[PDB]
Design a protein around this ligand. Structure first.
Ligand SMILES: *[C@@H]1O[C@H](CO)[C@@H](O[C@@H]2O[C@H](CO)[C@@H](O)[C@H](O)[C@H]2NC(C)=O)[C@H](O)[C@H]1NC(C)=O
Ligand SMILES: *[C@@H]1O[C@H](CO)[C@@H](O[C@@H]2O[C@H](CO)[C@@H](O)[C@H](O)[C@H]2NC(C)=O)[C@H](O)[C@H]1NC(C)=O
Ligand SMILES: *[C@@H]1O[C@H](CO)[C@@H](O[C@@H]2O[C@H](CO)[C@@H](O)[C@H](O)[C@H]2NC(C)=O)[C@H](O)[C@H]1NC(C)=O
Ligand SMILES: *[C@@H]1O[C@H](CO)[C@@H](O[C@@H]2O[C@H](CO)[C@@H](O)[C@H](O)[C@H]2NC(C)=O)[C@H](O)[C@H]1NC(C)=O
Ligand SMILES: *[C@@H]1O[C@H](CO)[C@@H](O[C@@H]2O[C@H](CO)[C@@H](O)[C@H](O)[C@H]2NC(C)=O)[C@H](O)[C@H]1NC(C)=O
Ligand SMILES: *[C@@H]1O[C@H](CO)[C@@H](O[C@@H]2O[C@H](CO)[C@@H](O)[C@H](O)[C@H]2NC(C)=O)[C@H](O)[C@H]1NC(C)=O
Ligand SMILES: *[C@@H]1O[C@H](CO)[C@@H](O)[C@H](O)[C@H]1NC(C)=O
Ligand SMILES: *[C@@H]1O[C@H](CO)[C@@H](O)[C@H](O)[C@H]1NC(C)=O
Ligand SMILES: *[C@@H]1O[C@H](CO)[C@@H](O)[C@H](O)[C@H]1NC(C)=O
Ligand SMILES: *[C@@H]1O[C@H](CO)[C@@H](O)[C@H](O)[C@H]1NC(C)=O
Lengths: 167, 49, 236
């Protein structure tokens, strides 16, 4: 007996009941996904379409066939991905690492040292100290590069070494 | 150097002490475009039930 | 139009040689100029592929289907176990505008033919679950591979301009992945569909087995050659 004047109790109410079933068949309906934005040339971690991993992402010129979603190299390590939205090929490089070594003339003589980061580009060291030198063996902090040549006191590598005169 | 070598005096040379690695800055999440919505508006905004 | 056409056509099924056909990309990974060994279900090299020139055949674990077709008389495929309304059944057809895929409980005619006058094959259609419409798949060589595992139905395909007259060529060409269906079913047997005007079709069928293969990826991530790993001692 729905009438415009029937009070709150007699109001016509539309009711929809939603039931969820998750039978053994593969799921077909899911909620939103909320993808974030993109960064480059920075050591970050990612979960591209459920594929997780850390490293630095750069632009790459590899050409995928229109049906691959990512690529990997020999020894089964992922090297490239394709972003699901822009559909372009990005390259992955592991974040840099290495060992550190200390060059000292001996506590007997002095107590100032120099530091060498092995196989690391002289761009992400940190911290400042003195002038910083870049060598084929890594990056060196706390010594001055000269143009003379002598015998080798403390071998460093790639045909260069250091001595105490300062270091 | 003194701690790794376990002595209060250090002889002249070069010694390997520790390791260095860069830390991640932030996290990035990427996913395909949101499309093919589940039709609910037409049922819920239907004139006749 | 549930009519009968023939009773006893050409009975003896011929046999012929597979050679080196029936290779497909087993995943979506990109590889460049590298050799990769993988264990999966393939069609053995130089196998015995059955030539038909149209009964219900077993599905076993996978099927390789080939057709040296012109004017695309073949129309679709039917998959199921009981082939009636008491169980799930899968139907695929390809008409001039859009390939159509359905999953229902039909009552297929004993001699299901399409003809032109999307019915005439099933006498009923109810409790449909999955539907799909896409661009149609189709002196041409059409190769398809049908697999079913983990409630997923996988279809790979390839088209080739063939100039040979009788049988499969002595060439190599990989098969790209085409379609995946996330539908659970127990296909065990299947059947071919033809639409003949009211007034003899040649195709080839082979079966898959589990074994190991060696594949070569060129610079652009395309499979250019493969080696069966149990054919002869040189291959080992
Ligand atoms: C996902 O949606 C975005 C938003 O529209 C698409 O980005 C646009 O794509 C069109 C088509 O080429 C371009 O003309 C626009 O310049 C894009 N806008 C941007 C990048 O801000 C994107 O292509 C979609 N991706 C798909 C559908 O895979
Ligand atoms: C350390 O990183 C810098 C930055 O990428 C390198 O400098 C680049 O070198 C390449 C090739 O030599 C050039 O194409 C780029 O234009 C340079 N970029 C900049 C910003 O200078 C540098 O070569 C790296 N160190 C070493 C030893 O290779
Ligand atoms: C081919 O099969 C389709 C399968 O639906 C038939 O249906 C039409 O397909 C067109 C293609 O976009 C749609 O625009 C129509 O709406 C569909 N019809 C209906 C009733 O939904 C199509 O008619 C078939 N064509 C031929 C020539 O057989
Ligand atoms: C119509 O088909 C669906 C599936 O395609 C059938 O769903 C069944 O649902 C019950 C309970 O929800 C399950 O225990 C069965 O395993 C399902 N069957 C299958 C094949 O998945 C549904 O019963 C069918 N309805 C009719 C009237 O045939
Ligand atoms: C194919 O048929 C088999 C029956 O032989 C189904 O296997 C049953 O699956 C249900 C659900 O997990 C179990 O409760 C039963 O015990 C299984 N029976 C047997 C005999 O193993 C199977 O689910 C069917 N395939 C699909 C895709 O539904
Ligand atoms: C693999 O990819 C390369 C790179 O695109 C292809 O080389 C190009 O081929 C086209 C077609 O002949 C030429 O128009 C371009 O000039 C080629 N690029 C260069 C840089 O020479 C190559 O054809 C592809 N296929 C094979 C088998 O190598
Ligand atoms: C350094 O060594 C010399 C001998 O080599 C010694 O005479 C001197 O006392 C030492 N200086 C120190 C330990 O500070
Ligand atoms: C000499 O050393 C200085 C400082 O390390 C350097 O800038 C210069 O290139 C070297 N060579 C010459 C010829 O000056
Ligand atoms: C129904 O339409 C109204 C019109 O303003 C809108 O505000 C509301 O969000 C719609 N609801 C659904 C479920 O579509
Ligand atoms: C298939 O087997 C038959 C015998 O059953 C044989 O005559 C024929 O040559 C074989 N075909 C092959 C191996 O391609």
């Amino acid at each position: 007996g729905f009438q415009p004047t029937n009070g709150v109790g007699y109001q016509p109410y539309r009711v929809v009941v939603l039931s969820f079933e998750l039978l053994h068949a593969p799921a077909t309906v899911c909620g939103p996904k909320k993808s974030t934005n993109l960064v480059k040339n920075k050591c970050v971690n990612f979960n591209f379409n459920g594929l997780t991993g850390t490293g630095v992402l750069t632009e790459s010129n590899k050409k995928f066939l229109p049906f691959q979603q990512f690529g990997r190299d020999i020894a089964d390590t992922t090297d490239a991905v394709r972003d699901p939205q822009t559909l372009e090929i990005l390259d992955i490089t592991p974040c840099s690492f290495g060992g550190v070594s200390v060059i000292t003339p001996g506590t007997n003589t002095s107590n100032q040292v120099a530091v060498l980061y092995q196989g690391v580009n002289c761009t992400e060291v940190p911290s400042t100290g003195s002038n910083v030198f870049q060598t084929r063996a890594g990056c060196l902090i706390g010594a001055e590069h000269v143009n003379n040549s002598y015998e080798c006191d403390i071998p460093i590598g790639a045909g260069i070494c250091a001595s105490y005169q300062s270091i | 150097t003194k701690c790794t070598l376990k002595s209060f005096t250090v002889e002249k040379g070069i010694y390997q002490t520790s390791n260095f690695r860069v830390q991640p800055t932030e996290s990035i999440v990427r996913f395909p475009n949101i499309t093919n919505l589940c039709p609910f508006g037409e049922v819920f905004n239907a004139t006749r039930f | 139009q549930c009519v009968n056409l023939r009773t006893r056509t050409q009975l003896p099924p011929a046999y012929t040689n597979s050679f080196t056909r029936g290779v497909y990309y087993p995943d979506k990974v990109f590889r460049s100029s590298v050799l990769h060994s993988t264990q999966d279900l393939f069609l053995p090299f130089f196998s015995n592929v059955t030539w038909f020139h149209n009964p219900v055949l077993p599905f076993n674990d996978g099927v390789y289907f080939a057709s040296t077709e012109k004017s695309n008389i073949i129309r679709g495929w039917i998959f199921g176990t009981t082939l009636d309304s008491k169980t799930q059944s899968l139907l695929i057809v390809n008409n001039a505008t859009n390939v159509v895929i359905k999953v229902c409980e039909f009552q297929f005619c004993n001699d299901p033919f399409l003809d032109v006058y999307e019915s005439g094959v099933y006498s009923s259609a109810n409790n449909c679950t999955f539907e799909y419409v896409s661009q149609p798949f189709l002196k041409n060589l059409r190769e398809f591979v049908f697999k079913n595992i983990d409630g997923y139905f996988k279809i790979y395909s390839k088209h080739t301009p063939i100039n040979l007259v009788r049988d499969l060529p002595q060439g190599f060409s990989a098969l790209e992945p085409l379609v995946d269906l996330p539908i659970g079913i127990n296909i065990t047997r299947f059947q071919t569909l033809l639409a003949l005007h009211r007034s003899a079709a040649a195709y080839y069928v082979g079966y898959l087995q589990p074994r190991t293969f060696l594949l070569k990826y060129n610079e652009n991530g395309t499979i250019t050659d493969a080696v069966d790993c149990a054919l002869d001692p040189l291959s080992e």
